[PDB]
Design an enzyme around this catalytic site. Structure first.
Site, PDB file in Angstrom:
ATOM      1  N   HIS A 184       0.145   6.048   3.263  1.00  0.00           N
ATOM      2  CA  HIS A 184       0.003   5.402   2.043  1.00  0.00           C
ATOM      3  C   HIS A 184      -1.409   5.397   1.465  1.00  0.00           C
ATOM      4  CE1 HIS A 184      -2.033   1.754   3.071  1.00  0.00           C
ATOM      5  NE2 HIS A 184      -1.520   1.940   4.309  1.00  0.00           N
ATOM      6  N   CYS A 202      -1.434   2.040  10.227  1.00  0.00           N
ATOM      7  CA  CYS A 202      -0.992   2.685   8.881  1.00  0.00           C
ATOM      8  C   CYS A 202      -2.196   3.798   8.958  1.00  0.00           C
ATOM      9  CB  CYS A 202      -0.860   2.039   7.577  1.00  0.00           C
ATOM     10  SG  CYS A 202       0.724   1.305   7.934  1.00  0.00           S
TER      11      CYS A 202
END
Length: 256
Positions: A184, A202
């Site tokens: 992301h 992440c």
């Protein structure tokens, strides 16, 4: 006393070379062998595959290796009226057809802190990344690309004010594990991307790079994480199927 099967991927979809066939039921399956016998998978070009249960409601089928681009897959779930055990019967049949797309494999290498996207073997993008910090590292292994979200509030309460907990809104988010790993946009860590790991796990990349990933990487494409200080993504994560060695996958768990 009826249970309904649901097949992924979707009928008519094109998916990446990592995509397993998934048959998910809305009830616990008592007789897993009964379900497996009711599901017929046709491949062209033909390749061997096998069933492995992620849990009591979902069975997966995949080949030994990533699918060959262009393969056409037909899935016949012939469960209508079938005795699935403990007095539960299949509510309907399901029939899906899909094809495998180009080979898209993105490798995130903690030694270089770069996420490299290869399409049919050629490098098409080189994206600096910031992965999980040492205390909350990104697990090594093979991740199947799942869903994508233009923006998504990642609220780990799916508790925020607990030790390695969080609640964050992010853009251009591609899901790569059910455990909550995403690729992301992280404009706040661009400085660190390519140098220092700062996340809860992440794969932080630049806004530009995250949007490119969202636009170009599709469900079933592969992310491989290598050289981190983490453990290994669990085979039964939901998108971690390929971390189960083939011998074990192929043996299955129909009696478990």
């Amino acid at each position: 006393h009826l249970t309904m099967p649901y097949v992924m991927p979707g009928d008519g979809e094109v998916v990446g070379v990592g995509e397993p066939v998934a048959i998910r039921f809305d009830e616990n399956i008592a007789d897993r062998g009964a379900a497996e016998k009711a599901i017929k998978i046709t491949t062209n070009p033909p390749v061997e595959g096998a069933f492995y249960w992620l849990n009591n409601r979902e069975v997966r089928w995949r080949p030994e290796h990533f699918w060959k681009p262009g393969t056409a897959v037909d899935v016949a779930v012939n469960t209508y009226g079938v005795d699935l055990g403990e007095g539960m019967f299949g509510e309907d049949n399901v029939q899906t057809h899909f094809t495998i797309g180009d080979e898209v494999i993105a490798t995130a290498d903690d030694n270089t802190k770069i996420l490299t996207v290869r399409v049919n073997g050629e490098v098409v993008k080189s994206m600096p990344t910031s992965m999980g910090k040492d205390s909350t590292p990104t697990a090594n292994g093979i991740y199947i690309v799942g869903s994508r979200y233009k923006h998504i509030i990642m609220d780990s309460s799916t508790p925020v004010n607990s030790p390695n907990g969080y609640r964050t809104d992010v853009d251009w988010a591609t899901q790569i594990s059910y455990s909550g790993v995403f690729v992301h946009s992280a404009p706040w860590s661009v400085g660190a991307q390519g140098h220092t790991n700062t996340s809860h796990g992440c794969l932080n990349v630049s806004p530009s790079n995250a949007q490119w990933f969202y636009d170009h990487v599709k469900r079933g494409d592969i992310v491989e994480v290598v050289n981190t200080v983490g453990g290994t993504l669990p085979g039964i994560d939901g998108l971690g199927d390929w971390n189960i060695p083939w011998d074990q996958w192929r043996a299955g768990n129909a009696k478990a």
